[PDB]
Design a protein around this ligand. Sequence first.
Ligand SMILES: [Zn+2]
Ligand SMILES: [Zn+2]
Ligand SMILES: [Zn+2]
Ligand SMILES: [Zn+2]
Ligand SMILES: [Zn+2]
Ligand SMILES: [Zn+2]
Lengths: 96, 98
Amino acid sequence: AIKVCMNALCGAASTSGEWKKGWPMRSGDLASLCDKCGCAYEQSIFCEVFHAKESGWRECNSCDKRLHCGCIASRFMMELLENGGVTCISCAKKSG
Amino acid sequence: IKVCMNALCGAASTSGEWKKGWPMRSGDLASLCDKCGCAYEQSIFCEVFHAKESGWRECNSCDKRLHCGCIASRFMMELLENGGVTCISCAKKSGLIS
Ligand SMILES: [Zn+2]
Ligand SMILES: [Zn+2]
Ligand SMILES: [Zn+2]
Ligand SMILES: [Zn+2]
Ligand SMILES: [Zn+2]
Ligand SMILES: [Zn+2]
């Protein structure tokens, strides 16, 4: 396959250094991210930097953290609550 | 006491049938009264009960609205590799049914 940045709103076909590790894709393999997108992802702010204008934002039920929902990039950064809404992964570790 | 598992309903009775709802965190299907369950079966549960919540998006290839970050709508869509979501019809048409 052609290797390209898996941020679909970037799609860069080249990068500085090696490709960076991204989020798990549906197949389980890790996404390839360019130097920019991968840098945001490493700092845990990919969606805040690159999905700021997309729909689907909610907030964590236990803290102020905004969470981009319906998004593969943030998919394992939150938990779906039985009574509605989401909590981020830190608060989820704190609540069992 | 058996109660409708839509927290904004909680009716203690039902007409005809308790209907099967969304898969809960444990994997079991929720028990819904006939109202809420009919809304669920027609894929409009979140449109009826969650219209004012955050988390709403649009299907990647059609106009269907999809309530994301919501356990009730979680088997009503598929997450795409491009960061968006697709409804179940578009998913069946694209080969993405998991
Ligand atoms: Zn990129
Ligand atoms: Zn995102
Ligand atoms: Zn939180
Ligand atoms: Zn009900
Ligand atoms: Zn909903
Ligand atoms: Zn669709």
